[PDB]
Design a protein around this ligand. Sequence first.
Ligand SMILES: CC(C)CCC[C@@H](C)CCC[C@@H](C)CCC[C@@H](C)CCOC[C@@H](CO)OCC[C@H](C)CCC[C@H](C)CCC[C@H](C)CCCC(C)C
Ligand SMILES: CC(C)CCC[C@@H](C)CCC[C@@H](C)CCC[C@@H](C)CCOC[C@@H](CO)OCC[C@H](C)CCC[C@H](C)CCC[C@H](C)CCCC(C)C
Ligand SMILES: CC(C)CCC[C@@H](C)CCC[C@@H](C)CCC[C@@H](C)CCOC[C@@H](CO)OCC[C@H](C)CCC[C@H](C)CCC[C@H](C)CCCC(C)C
Ligand SMILES: *C/C=C(C)/C=C/C=C(C)/C=C/C1=C(C)CCCC1(C)C
Ligand SMILES: *C/C=C(C)/C=C/C=C(C)/C=C/C1=C(C)CCCC1(C)C
Ligand SMILES: *C/C=C(C)/C=C/C=C(C)/C=C/C1=C(C)CCCC1(C)C
Ligand SMILES: CCCCCCCCCCCCCCC
Ligand SMILES: CCCCCCCCCCCCCCC
Ligand SMILES: CCCCCCCCCCCCCCC
Ligand SMILES: CCCCCCCCCCCCCCC
Ligand SMILES: CCCCCCCCCCCCCCC
Ligand SMILES: CCCCCCCCCCCCCCC
Ligand SMILES: CCCCCCCCCCCCCC
Ligand SMILES: CCCCCCCCCCCCCC
Ligand SMILES: CCCCCCCCCCCCC
Ligand SMILES: CCCCCCCCCCCCC
Ligand SMILES: CCCCCCCCCCCCC
Ligand SMILES: CCCCCCCCCCC
Ligand SMILES: CCCCCCCCCCC
Ligand SMILES: CCCCCCCCCCC
Ligand SMILES: CCCCCCCCCC
Ligand SMILES: CCCCCCCCCC
Ligand SMILES: CCCCCCCCCC
Ligand SMILES: CCCCCCCCC
Ligand SMILES: CCCCCCCCC
Ligand SMILES: CCCCCCCCC
Ligand SMILES: CCCCCCCC
Ligand SMILES: CCCCCCCC
Ligand SMILES: CCCCCCCC
Ligand SMILES: CCCCCCCC
Ligand SMILES: CCCCCCCC
Ligand SMILES: CCCCCCCC
Ligand SMILES: CCCCCCCC
Lengths: 231, 231, 231
Amino acid sequence: ITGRPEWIWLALGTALMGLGTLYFLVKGMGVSDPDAKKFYAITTLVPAIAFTMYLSMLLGYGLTMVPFGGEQNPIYWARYADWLFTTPLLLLDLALLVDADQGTILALVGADGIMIGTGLVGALTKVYSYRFVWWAISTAAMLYILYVLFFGFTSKAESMRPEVASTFKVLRNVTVVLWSAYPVVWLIGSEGAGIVPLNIETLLFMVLDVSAKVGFGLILLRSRAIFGEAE
Amino acid sequence: ITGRPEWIWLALGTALMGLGTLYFLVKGMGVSDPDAKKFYAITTLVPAIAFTMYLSMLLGYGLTMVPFGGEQNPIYWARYADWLFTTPLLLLDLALLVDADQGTILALVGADGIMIGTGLVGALTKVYSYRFVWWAISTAAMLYILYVLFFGFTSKAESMRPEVASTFKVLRNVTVVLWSAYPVVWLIGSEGAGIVPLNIETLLFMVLDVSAKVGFGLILLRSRAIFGEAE
Amino acid sequence: ITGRPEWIWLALGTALMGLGTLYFLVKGMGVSDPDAKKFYAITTLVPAIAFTMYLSMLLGYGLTMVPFGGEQNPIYWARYADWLFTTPLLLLDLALLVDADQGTILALVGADGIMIGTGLVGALTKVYSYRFVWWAISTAAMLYILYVLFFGFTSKAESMRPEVASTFKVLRNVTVVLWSAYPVVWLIGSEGAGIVPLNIETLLFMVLDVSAKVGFGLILLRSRAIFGEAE
Ligand SMILES: CC(C)CCC[C@@H](C)CCC[C@@H](C)CCC[C@@H](C)CCOC[C@@H](CO)OCC[C@H](C)CCC[C@H](C)CCC[C@H](C)CCCC(C)C
Ligand SMILES: CC(C)CCC[C@@H](C)CCC[C@@H](C)CCC[C@@H](C)CCOC[C@@H](CO)OCC[C@H](C)CCC[C@H](C)CCC[C@H](C)CCCC(C)C
Ligand SMILES: CC(C)CCC[C@@H](C)CCC[C@@H](C)CCC[C@@H](C)CCOC[C@@H](CO)OCC[C@H](C)CCC[C@H](C)CCC[C@H](C)CCCC(C)C
Ligand SMILES: *C/C=C(C)/C=C/C=C(C)/C=C/C1=C(C)CCCC1(C)C
Ligand SMILES: *C/C=C(C)/C=C/C=C(C)/C=C/C1=C(C)CCCC1(C)C
Ligand SMILES: *C/C=C(C)/C=C/C=C(C)/C=C/C1=C(C)CCCC1(C)C
Ligand SMILES: CCCCCCCCCCCCCCC
Ligand SMILES: CCCCCCCCCCCCCCC
Ligand SMILES: CCCCCCCCCCCCCCC
Ligand SMILES: CCCCCCCCCCCCCCC
Ligand SMILES: CCCCCCCCCCCCCCC
Ligand SMILES: CCCCCCCCCCCCCCC
Ligand SMILES: CCCCCCCCCCCCCC
Ligand SMILES: CCCCCCCCCCCCCC
Ligand SMILES: CCCCCCCCCCCCC
Ligand SMILES: CCCCCCCCCCCCC
Ligand SMILES: CCCCCCCCCCCCC
Ligand SMILES: CCCCCCCCCCC
Ligand SMILES: CCCCCCCCCCC
Ligand SMILES: CCCCCCCCCCC
Ligand SMILES: CCCCCCCCCC
Ligand SMILES: CCCCCCCCCC
Ligand SMILES: CCCCCCCCCC
Ligand SMILES: CCCCCCCCC
Ligand SMILES: CCCCCCCCC
Ligand SMILES: CCCCCCCCC
Ligand SMILES: CCCCCCCC
Ligand SMILES: CCCCCCCC
Ligand SMILES: CCCCCCCC
Ligand SMILES: CCCCCCCC
Ligand SMILES: CCCCCCCC
Ligand SMILES: CCCCCCCC
Ligand SMILES: CCCCCCCC
């Protein structure tokens, strides 16, 4: 484990995702509202999945070597197995908050799968220049997601209860800022141009992951928007 | 790329799926009917997924070598990753058109997963004679799907609006004819008996894919069956 | 095939899953109740999936070698591909029986995916002591599932029709007893401590699989709880 300088950030990430999972699990014990139960189930699964994948990276299972640039490059593939399941769950939290229609939910989840799937292909591609073709396709899929979150959901939240509109607006802004950083870290990190070393890259993804999952969840599950209007 | 004679058909397929995706995306911009939005989302995702997998084959990522018959045989595995997601989406288009019940939808999607999954196992199997055992199981799963589309959905469409009944009947006939060709191309192509060479096999799958996805989508999204009855 | 002593139990399992699939398929022909159709579709898919994965193990495709303990250990990975899809389908049978809320269904299916996913990682892990870390995480996920089936569903079934309450109680008890045996067989078998040899381990999993899928299905599909109350 300790033979890799980035191990400290993988261990911290593992701990923070595990602690986040347990807090949400305990906090959700005393909840019977069927609407609130939906948000607790979605939001608790997110850091639980991330916990297992951070642990796999810490123990060395989620790491492979990819030859490109005449070098064997360490690629943590477990990140994409994490994101494949956690990013659509996070979008479902937002879509259920605004009572989005089914067709829009399917478009979001499908574009998200394309985003993560093409990012994985780009991470494992051995022809250096082709890695950035996949990065560009994946980034186009992300821009579609961000467009929908702004010019489809925002207008839908305003016609909703005030507390669900204000909570959505906050979580929307958090998501757009944090998610946009991921393609940048990829491009300048060891998967892309190799400007930033792997140990610093790992620290950046850990800060982003914890903020986008645990921080996101703390804002959502403390809001009254997750409960139905009741007397 | 150009070192493979089949590259021209992979490049054409990539272009036609990309163009198809963009047309459906633009055409769906001016749509607010929640029913129509469902069909546009399903139908636009189909060629978008196929685009990415054709590109992976063009660039050489979606290709592996499988030893059988005393030879290293080029097997494009990316086809099955495509079909795993696009064939159930196409069946969902048909099932939603006739307002099929949930139990029937699950049976269709499950049989479809078995069809594609066993076809993938057959494509990667190293014992030559066993490849055709998997082909037979996969073909049995397809025949179940075709039976349901005829002796379960057809009777359901007649009790529906006339425009949804006539549109379903057309898309049903297109699907049964085109899908039935796939097991035949597999059997006589490089995955099976090896009668037809890979470059011709690739041309045939490209014609079938574009027809079953883009051609299918053009018929559906030009129909009024996708809109609810409104004044 | 016959070069492996466990082949006899893989062949028996294949036959019993295939026969089970055909019986459920025939029995479900004469069913039009939309509620009953749901249970028949879920319950017939379970042994059909298991059939294909037992066949892959029989023919040698679903087997790999994992080095640990200074030895190349035969690991049947196809079991986890089976369980990944069949265990959530079995939980869906139970959840639909008691009309569970959506949030609870998602929590069950998500915990089940974590259970199977971490068990697969543990089966393929090359550092011997780490294999049991994954076993423990997977077992914690199972205990969560069992808790929900007892202290969330049981109370919900009592407020239901008497026949659905008594049928659920029976299937609940069958599930908790049979599922609990799996982590024990893993721990003492070739994936874990290696006390029980592989051929005996394979026999035990076959008895458990057939009972948990075909036996489970025979109890459910003979009950009147799967039909709506009708005159
Ligand atoms: C509606 C939305 C959900 C739609 C989703 C969008 C999606 C279509 C976007 C594209 C996804 C696609 C790129 C997934 C590729 C997975 C692949 C990286 C797995 C590893 O295989 C890659 C190479 C080794 O580098 O295999 C070496 C050769 C091996 C012999 C490969 C044989 C196994 C194949 C991988 C079998 C295909 C399985 C499916 C891809 C499983 C789904 C994986 C997940 C990442 C989507
Ligand atoms: C309700 C419906 C959706 C049900 C679906 C029906 C489905 C059950 C039908 C059978 C599907 C099954 C054959 C999928 C097999 C995937 C497999 C080809 C992936 C590549 O692995 C094959 C060998 C190399 O040749 O791995 C070499 C050895 C490696 C060490 C393998 C270890 C990884 C395992 C593959 C882990 C299992 C992952 C799941 C199979 C992922 C789903 C893939 C998709 C193709 C279903
Ligand atoms: C809501 C719920 C459904 C959530 C589900 C819970 C889930 C997150 C729990 C953890 C699942 C995770 C451990 C799955 C790992 C699959 C992995 C074993 C496949 C084989 O790859 C392992 C190594 C060889 O030993 O690959 C060698 C290196 C290769 C180069 C690997 C590159 C391919 C990657 C495997 C791509 C990721 C694909 C996804 C993991 C596909 C889903 C598989 C299924 C088992 C979940
Ligand atoms: C909890 C994890 C989250 C919210 C991860 C989000 C990840 C992304 C938005 C990743 C995007 C990428 C691109 C847009 C292209 C480059 C490759 C990716 C996958 C890093
Ligand atoms: C857009 C792609 C489509 C509609 C693909 C359809 C593919 C099939 C219907 C494939 C069927 C197969 C068999 C029936 C057995 C032989 C292997 C397959 C997977 C080619
Ligand atoms: C039809 C198959 C069924 C119902 C299989 C159930 C399997 C389990 C409940 C497996 C559980 C495991 C653990 C709890 C940890 C050890 C590894 C597993 C996956 C065997
Ligand atoms: C979206 C965030 C990207 C900003 C990356 C900042 C990295 C600064 C760290 C110093 C770079 C290390 C280079 C010298 C080793
Ligand atoms: C009462 C609110 C705080 C509860 C404690 C939460 C502990 C989980 C770890 C959170 C750290 C990361 C927060 C986002 C920066
Ligand atoms: C379902 C369509 C299958 C028909 C295949 C027709 C192939 C004819 C092309 C000529 C065969 C090439 C053999 C000589 C190289
Ligand atoms: C107005 C209808 C035609 C629009 C142009 C569609 C261009 C997408 C490519 C379609 C070619 C394949 C059609 C099926 C044979
Ligand atoms: C949950 C069931 C686990 C019980 C396992 C009993 C196995 C007894 C078979 C004899 C053990 C073989 C050891 C000598 C070869
Ligand atoms: C009339 C009920 C029996 C029908 C025959 C079922 C045959 C399928 C194989 C069942 C054997 C396994 C039963 C569970 C132990
Ligand atoms: C194995 C991959 C299957 C999933 C394909 C994605 C489409 C799923 C459609 C689900 C239809 C709704 C069923 C109720
Ligand atoms: C990782 C594979 C999980 C999918 C298994 C297929 C069954 C899914 C059941 C979904 C139940 C409906 C939830 C609302
Ligand atoms: C185009 C939709 C408007 C909202 C999206 C904001 C774009 C942020 C740019 C992200 C940069 C990634 C490289
Ligand atoms: C048996 C259901 C009737 C409709 C299915 C038509 C069968 C077409 C044969 C396809 C040939 C594939 C080898
Ligand atoms: C803790 C929830 C109560 C019901 C679960 C029964 C636990 C059975 C123990 C299984 C042993 C697996 C190692
Ligand atoms: C080795 C660098 C080659 C540059 C390729 C950049 C491709 C980016 C595509 C974005 C449209
Ligand atoms: C090398 C050819 C061996 C023939 C096997 C055919 C199997 C087909 C099974 C269809 C029932
Ligand atoms: C080689 C045996 C090492 C023992 C590790 C046991 C780990 C079990 C963790 C359960 C909390
Ligand atoms: C609940 C605390 C979980 C912390 C265990 C993971 C941290 C790795 C320490 C080496
Ligand atoms: C929108 C046009 C997309 C065409 C790019 C793919 C074709 C491959 C050319 C080499
Ligand atoms: C319907 C009977 C299915 C039996 C075939 C599988 C058994 C393997 C025999 C070698
Ligand atoms: C993106 C930063 C999240 C901050 C988490 C703190 C929330 C406390 C209510
Ligand atoms: C299967 C052939 C499809 C033909 C596509 C043309 C549709 C234009 C309306
Ligand atoms: C767990 C044992 C199941 C027994 C199956 C027999 C059911 C006949 C109704
Ligand atoms: C009005 C809410 C502002 C939230 C933005 C937070 C950016 C990290
Ligand atoms: C909408 C604000 C985008 C912020 C992008 C930050 C990328 C590091
Ligand atoms: C009555 C519609 C006929 C459609 C069949 C088209 C076959 C390619
Ligand atoms: C229902 C007509 C089937 C046509 C099969 C064509 C196979 C090449
Ligand atoms: C295995 C075939 C079953 C025969 C019919 C059983 C009575 C519905
Ligand atoms: C009251 C029903 C008892 C069922 C338990 C069966 C254990 C195999
Ligand atoms: C609730 C009874 C548990 C039985 C466990 C059996 C494990 C072999």
